[PDB]
Amino acid sequence: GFSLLFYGVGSKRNFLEEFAIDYLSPKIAYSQLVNSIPCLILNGYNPSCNYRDVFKEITDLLVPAELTRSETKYWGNHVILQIQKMIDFYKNQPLDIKLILVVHNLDGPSIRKNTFQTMLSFLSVIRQIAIVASTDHIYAPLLWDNMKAQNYNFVFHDISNFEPSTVESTFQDVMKMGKSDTSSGAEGAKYVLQSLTVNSKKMYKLLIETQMQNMGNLSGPKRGTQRTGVELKLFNHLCAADFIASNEIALRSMLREFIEHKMANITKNNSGMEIIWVPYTYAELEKLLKTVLNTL
Amino acid sequence: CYETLWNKVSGERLTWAASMESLEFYFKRVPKNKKKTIVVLLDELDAMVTKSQDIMYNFFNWTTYENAKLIVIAVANTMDLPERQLGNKITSRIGFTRIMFTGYTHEELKNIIDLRLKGLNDSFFYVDTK
């Protein structure tokens, strides 16, 4: 019932993945006797992480009990309450590891926020799941309170290997001395479109052009949101006229890949319509249109 | 708007979304041997497109279909309003007719006023004094 924390200089991705996947899981599975313990890899360097999706997949894997009306309180958070309910429930089951989770960069640009740390601290009290994590920053211990350090129950290990870290340095533009707005995340979109099929690229180009038109007509550095999106029916009518998609089934099939990578969102307004929108900035959208999709 | 149009062509009473799909299907797939031409008069168009261009795009696009028999007449204040809303290529595809109404002059206005007073001006009246 401890929690490892690996720190040092270099890249700890390959080490952590090789240790968690190839060694710990089969050994735990054999020691509890059939199938191996599922592992939830949690990328940290990605600026587009969201704890709601992480808790959704945790719920899917563990299947916790639901929340009664008397426990929802008055406009109370529905994540911390469920975590506390799980903690109270798991204090009587037999001590067996049922899930192993790997946090690659515990102090990334988007996982260092207070709410995410609170969720992870509460999730680590449960003795039936195993934590492995790593950090890169040098003022990392400042991030943990006197109460979070109590229930994290950390044990510190040092591993330095001077690894190149060629994967973590993909969401930022190294060519500009690393001052490329790390919290934006627009470089990952370029990297993904570098290796996509021809049909998807044209659809993304059409969506970007329409969203840019709407943003220009409605409003600079303002970010794009639901107010400047495109209706699903209108987008289907537009794309069907360029031999990109035939029916709504194909469009909804090829939109899931873009939705999963946090490069496009679908949501409903007050009037019941469906709006798709890209959470980028006008300058970044123009750069994307000019540098990678201009030539097709 | 949607439901109103449907309520004026079918007699049914549906919500706005279902009215939208109903109108789409009616204008797209119903054969031309079992329909009747319709003359819509979309008016004060600038008050509909204030959050999105959905209504204008749908109403203008329904004239593209071959099976439809729609004749839309839309009046507005600004001339180049669709270009500022839809886009140049969509407007070029649609291909509508454009008309501009210039203001009046000091002769036409006087002609209107004089025409509106023809029988009364320079006439005779019986008036009771009491």
From Swiss-Prot, chain A:
Localization, UniProt: Nucleus
Summary of subunit composition and partner proteins: Component of the origin recognition complex (ORC) composed of at least ORC1, ORC2, ORC3, ORC4, ORC5 and ORC6. Interacts with MCM10 and TAH11.
Primary role: Component of the origin recognition complex (ORC) that binds origins of replication. It has a role in both chromosomal replication and mating type transcriptional silencing. Binds to the ARS consensus sequence (ACS) of origins of replication.
Family that this chain belongs to: Belongs to the ORC2 family.
Further comment: Present with 1700 molecules/cell in log phase SD medium.
Name of the featured protein: Origin recognition complex subunit 2
Residues of the full protein shown: 311 to 620 of 620
Swiss-Prot record, chain B:
Localisation per UniProt entry: Nucleus
Binding-site positions, Mg(2+): D43, E44
Highest taxon above the source species: Eukaryota
Binding site for ATP: E44, N77
Function statement: Component of the origin recognition complex (ORC) that binds origins of replication. It has a role in both chromosomal replication and mating type transcriptional silencing. Binds to the ARS consensus sequence (ACS) of origins of replication.
Subunit structure: Component of the origin recognition complex (ORC) composed of at least ORC1, ORC2, ORC3, ORC4, ORC5 and ORC6. Interacts with MCM10 and TAH11.
UniProt comment concerning the protein's domains: The N-terminus is dedicated to mating-type repression.
Note: Present with 3930 molecules/cell in log phase SD medium.
Family: Belongs to the ORC1 family.
Name of this protein: Origin recognition complex subunit 1
Span of the entire protein shown here: 524 to 653 of 914
